[PDB]
Amino acid sequence: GWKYFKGNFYYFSLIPKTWYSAEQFCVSRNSHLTSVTSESEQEFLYKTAGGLIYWIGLTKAGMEGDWSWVDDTPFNKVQSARFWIPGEPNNAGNNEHCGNIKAPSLQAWNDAPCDKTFLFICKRPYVP
Ligand SMILES: OC[C@H]1O[C@@H](O)[C@H](O)[C@@H](O)[C@@H]1O
Ligand SMILES: [Ca+2]
Structure with missing residues (x-):
């Protein structure tokens, strides 16, 4: 069920997990929870997330x-604003140290507690 976009495959999970248990699932599939490094990747992700x-x-x-x-992509504060x-990030309850895609918009991300369970997205490089 992996979806292909610009040199990477993406897995939109069917079962929810905590952030770290999600990341572990991704790692078990030779992947990582997805980074987002362009407007077109953000768009691809939020459109596929379907709300x-x-x-x-x-x-x-x-x-x-x-x-x-x-996944160790350097985080670009200016380009990601x-x-x-x-x-957001508003750091609710002083306990929101992980991030999700939440709104179907380029303005999509929210910080949420790492121990909350959500569906998750893995990203896996394609290497010809
Ligand atoms: O959804 C529950 C809460 O999560 C927090 O991360 C958000 O910043 C709040 O806006 C929201 O009410
Ligand atoms: Ca928040």
Whole structure:
């Protein structure tokens, strides 16, 4: 059921998991929770998500709590500013250290508690 887009395959899960259990599932399939590095990838993802919420590879790293990608794509704060839901990341309850795709818009991301369960998206490189 993997979907192909610009050199990568994507798995939109059918069962929900916590952020880390999701990432572990992705790793077990030679993949990672998805990074998002272009307007067209964001668009592909939120359109495919069909209005449902999916964990992506957003998580905090370092003492500063900077956002990062679990697949080790460097996180570009300037280029990604356009991708959050207005008001996010808001860090609710001081306990939202992972990120999901939530709204069907370029402005899609929300920070949510890592232990909450959601459907999730894996991203797997295609290597010819
Ligand atoms: O959905 C429950 C809550 O999750 C939080 O991450 C959001 O920032 C809030 O806007 C929302 O009410
Ligand atoms: Ca939030």
